[PDB]
A paper describes a structure:
The ligand-free structure of EcOpgD was determined at 2.95 Å resolution. The overall structure of the ligand-free EcOpgD resembles that of the ligand-free EcOpgG. The difference arises mainly from the closure motion of α-helix 3 to the substrate in the cleft.
Most Gram-negative bacteria synthesize osmo-regulated periplasmic glucans (OPG) in the periplasm or extracellular space. In this study, structural and functional analyses of OpgG and OpgD from Escherichia coli revealed that these proteins are β-1,2-glucanases with remarkably different activity from each other, establishing a new glycoside hydrolase family, GH186. The conformation of the region that forms the reaction pathway differs noticeably between OpgG and OpgD, which explains the observed low activity of OpgG.
Author numbering:
A (entry chain A), B (entry chain B): 35 to 558
Write the structure that this text describes.
Amino acid sequence: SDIADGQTQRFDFSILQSMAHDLAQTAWRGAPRPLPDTLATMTPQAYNSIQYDAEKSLWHNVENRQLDAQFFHMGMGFRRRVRMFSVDPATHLAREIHFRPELFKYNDAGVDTKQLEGQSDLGFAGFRVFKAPELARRDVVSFLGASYFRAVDDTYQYGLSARGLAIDTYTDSKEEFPDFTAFWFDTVKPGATTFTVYALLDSASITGAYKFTIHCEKSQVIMDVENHLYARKDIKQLGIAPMTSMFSCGTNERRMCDTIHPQIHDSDRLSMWRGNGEWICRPLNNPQKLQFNAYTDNNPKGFGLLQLDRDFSHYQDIMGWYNKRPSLWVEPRNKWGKGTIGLMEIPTTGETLNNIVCFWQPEKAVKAGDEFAFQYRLYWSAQPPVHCPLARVMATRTGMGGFSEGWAPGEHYPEKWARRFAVDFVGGDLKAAAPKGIEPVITLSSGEAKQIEILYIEPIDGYRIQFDWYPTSDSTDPVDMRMYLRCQGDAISETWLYQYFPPAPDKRQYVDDRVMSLEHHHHH
Amino acid sequence: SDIADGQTQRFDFSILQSMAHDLAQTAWRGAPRPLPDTLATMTPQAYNSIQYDAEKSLWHNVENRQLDAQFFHMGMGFRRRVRMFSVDPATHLAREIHFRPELFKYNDAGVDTKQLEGQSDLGFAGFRVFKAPELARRDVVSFLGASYFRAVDDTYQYGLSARGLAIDTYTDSKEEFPDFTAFWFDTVKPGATTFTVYALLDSASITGAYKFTIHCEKSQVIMDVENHLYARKDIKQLGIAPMTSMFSCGTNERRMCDTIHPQIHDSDRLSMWRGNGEWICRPLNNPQKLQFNAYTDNNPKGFGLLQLDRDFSHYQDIMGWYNKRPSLWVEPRNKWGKGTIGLMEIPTTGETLNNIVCFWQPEKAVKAGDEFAFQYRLYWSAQPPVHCPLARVMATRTGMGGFSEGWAPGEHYPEKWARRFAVDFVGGDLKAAAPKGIEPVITLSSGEAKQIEILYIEPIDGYRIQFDWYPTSDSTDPVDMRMYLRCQGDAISETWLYQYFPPAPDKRQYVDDRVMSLEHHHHH
Ligand SMILES: OC[C@H]1O[C@H](O[C@H]2O[C@H](CO)[C@@H](O)[C@H](O)[C@H]2O)[C@H](O)[C@@H](O)[C@@H]1O
């Protein structure tokens, strides 16, 4: 009856650490063996019409179950055979769920199932967990990819994603993508919306043992992650608790915004809570040139890629519902010590490319034989679980300056070239601080802040800081900008880090291409 | 006590039509005489520090006054001396209000009030009306300019303008700006929010007698307008009931949208209700080339420039509050017969130039001696007083096309060049009609409509019609597009008229200037 009917074996979190440790001592298993021909040469239509059998779900036998799970068929870009096991947490005894065609319904699929018959080694691509009131529709957790996984809050819309690990995302060499190659699921308890799933990570450079304790709460999904990592080789770049999102069109430097969509992004900013208590808002970019930024920290308290613009009218996407897509908050649960938060921002021209990658990278160079243990909570939800207790950046608007706000000239372009920055703040003591006097403190790597203005914005009960950036140089070098609000010498806001790309000096001017002629009269 | 203290003279609407018609028999009075030297050479500071004395207001002596009025001082571009009169409607007697310096507080004006002592013929630039509970501050109606005037709804935010008359706005010659040279004010009744103001129009080409019965309602201003017009010369273009708005950056053809404001406009569309009963929604353009359009009609039922996007977040303007600015509806009160609704859209690069002019222009060529009479109601309010009983366009969005919606390529631009149009409809019977089948009927001057899609939009309970436009020709000639929704042989929506400007053939392609280099790593 239960789908998991393989050889019984003892399993616990330490046996997996041993598996992973022992595995690190041998040669990497290498790239996956080709799939059976019937799957190797599949049209998307064909794959898509393969459907896991809902009545053979992982936990079909558990009464009052509030959670169930199904498996994705191997095929398409899923070339790694992920093995799946069921663990009775009472007896610490695991049984393998072997792939078999009986587990699936191949409908209008022209799949030669006969060549799948003895392929009990095929395993699956990954898995999804459903929660009540619907246990076979609208998954809330999905592990499917390499180390990749994602989840949803009460909107049920999937957005940014996370991975078990990142290796060499940005270096002299090509990036390496560790696979999760096996998952052990503790049988859910009747009534529970918490489930436990251990995973084995395997890769040319490194193995790991992972435990995921996953809480499908009413408003969000919380994941208690513990990992143990075993380097096989020297590693150039190790990325702990990595996130992957997309940013094409935002309120900032809008250079890829010729769609019907006012904004296009899965996430709009990096939030960092630093070990010293400082909060940072790093508005994400769609740079024309690939960028890596490393934010030095020690014992980071938290960091996330957030989607805080929840307004459909700002996106107009009735396919992907970007306004419903969630935020991801990484809460270190042990002291991670010295290192950097890496943000890679890749140039994109649409929404098909996850062009945003963020992770933690320990200070210390990774050498063959090094071992690591990280614990962290992930919160999949619209609003992060924590935010600055002070004035918070709500939005970072950028555009032409060189004029007076409200009086942008209609007949000529502006006299001088400048770039306008508008940073709206909403938050704590802004109201009580306002009479006492709010000074923005601005810091620029290059250029001069001019026409600094502080303006009340009734509709969001906040304050807008505008300044015009005037260049001092012919340099196209990135401009690292920094801003916070001050009041009687004390800071009253989070810090805003921005990365501006000044245009070429030949393009620091406007081309006025208008024509005012009696050539275009039309009668209807 | 009252400020009206010139010579008693009989006055009524007939007597003004006589002044106007008699005035037409003589030569135009010509361009205004130079102002006194102190006002000719004024800093905008100096002028702005002149304040009409609220204790000398027009209706200071009326008890239970729900309305009052004040005058604008002559100066700056106010060069025509407008004469102002008070009428007792009981006795049909009218006393002039002569300019006297004592009616104003000059403050830090730096003005030789002594060369303003004798000047009884100076008059004023214009007038404004205030309504309780603020009869000295938030104005609701303002006549100031030439034939120009404007009003506000319960937002109390000024936006687009009207005029008495438009002359030669688009022809071989330069435009002619008739001036309101005198106003007569029926004294307000106690308790009344209706007031009546008569106006004399005077211009090189034409004179006129205007009556404005102006209702300052709770939620809007309604103006009952009657004029009589007396042509002194042949006239190339006569524009009745004209409107003047602005449109810089909307959701359509976003060619001037590099501001911190997602949208900048005082109006977004030309709404027409034709003699035959057909409704038209013509979204306004900010074209790079000056356009005139003439929409043929017979006994037009109504027309207006509407500001239907009420959403602060779509504009982010806290100076001019575009979201609060009103719609203006012209409702002809008699059968105006054959002619054209004229729409001139001038190129702009900001908000300072009113680049939208719309008016009625009768079929018949205007010759000297001609007399005209129009009656129309003006509705200054957010929502026009009447709209299509069918489905209504809510927004016209344009952008890149040639890809599948929601899968815009990230690593390349689209293979082929096309322009995407997305018209959202939010009207009636769309829900009942969807099962029966909603056919979009598209008409194109040039090019072909491919990838035509009908998509339900939950958040506005509406339907989005998208099409890619592919060129058939190397021509840059404007493309008239026309769309309505049909179901079972019947039209179920208003007609959408759009005017598209294809780009030069050499620019019907995308330039891919991305770079993927290790050149830009940054440590903080
Ligand atoms: O399930 C989502 C995708 O996951 C995989 O893709 C990620 O992992 C790959 C490593 O095998 C990377 O090369 C890739 O760039 C990542 O997106 C999977 O292979 C894809 O086909 C899935 O869409």
